[PDB]
Symmetry: D2
Subunit: 117 residues, 4 copies
């Protein structure tokens, strides 16, 4: 109510929120090699508006072999989307990552680092 989380905990909470939000808002977005940098930037800028987010790095890894289809384009998906987000509440930073992990066959979300400033 609504302040039970210490801010280390909040930094972890907000990294989780931003990773899930980014993934679900943007997966499905039509994208090409020519687009894919500008889309990545809009995603970062959208992530940087969320509570406690102080850094967002997004890559949408698309190549022309991904656009060999009637449409001539592909979509943002767990397969081509990679995100690092840094969150800071008070003196604590958390580092959240999204990346398709081949061995897991799955776009994993994890906490890379939790860090006192």
């Amino acid at each position: 109510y609504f302040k039970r989380l210490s801010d280390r905990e909040r930094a972890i909470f907000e990294a989780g929120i931003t990773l899930g939000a980014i993934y679900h808002q943007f997966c499905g977005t039509p994208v090409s090699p020519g687009t894919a940098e500008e889309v990545a930037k809009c995603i970062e800028r959208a992530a940087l508006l969320q509570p406690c987010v102080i850094d967002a790095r997004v890559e949408v890894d698309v190549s022309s072999e991904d656009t060999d289809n009637y449409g001539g384009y592909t979509e943002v998906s767990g397969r081509n989307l990679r995100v690092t987000i840094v969150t800071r509440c008070g003196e604590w930073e958390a580092v959240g990552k999204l990346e398709f992990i081949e061995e897991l066959n799955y776009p994993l979300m994890w906490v890379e680092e939790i860090r006192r400033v």
Copy 2:
């Protein structure tokens, strides 16, 4: 799949498809007055990839976001879209805009033209 569909008909159909897709793909995107043009631009470029789409003009109309998070969301209240589809010799002008009188973001066709 398009053996009997006219180009005129496809222009209309693709404008509908593109407007539904934009709306549902981008509604809920965190936005602020400072993002809002760049968000518009990525929406445009995403639109321009889809079949028959030869033009797209988007605005996200966001003012000074007074709330806890300090931002708003792309929605039917703030999203304005005009797209032009061209299939063969036919163009449709498709539009999306909140129509104050109906209380709803309306999608419509402004013009169909050769």
Copy 3:
């Protein structure tokens, strides 16, 4: 738009809206029918839609990964919708077409009631 043109436009709107509203939804083999039905019901609220049939085609192999689930996508999602505006109907379809490597949307049929 005349009623016939409205029938086509609304079918395109509904396919586009459904595809991008629902893709990314987590789904498993026995999810897969309740999700399909949720999609039908949302399609039925759109102007002119009078029939919606949705299949979400997921097998245990699609779910052979760390999470144990998959997501609704261009590859597993099939939709037929029927629009009626006034005296005219349009049948709109969505399906992954292998030869095209693409989830194509198209008009199967335009016909008088």
Copy 4:
């Protein structure tokens, strides 16, 4: 990937992921009074597939088109995540004084 992350903090991370995912997957979904229960059920079932999610309760509290959409205004959610011996209860609800749909953790508790 989780060698150094405590299960307590994983429970918190996953709650956050699931609330953000729910919110952004489903906002925009056409809904009406007769929709609105069944929609909530599809959301819970979608939420329940996610890592560590063991419980999900959703309400959708419902012009030209004759319908409305799942939004931050009408969507309410409580999830329980369980990782190892720890549980977090995550909430999403519109808070009037904040004029914002807040996501927050209501409690973290031992199993």
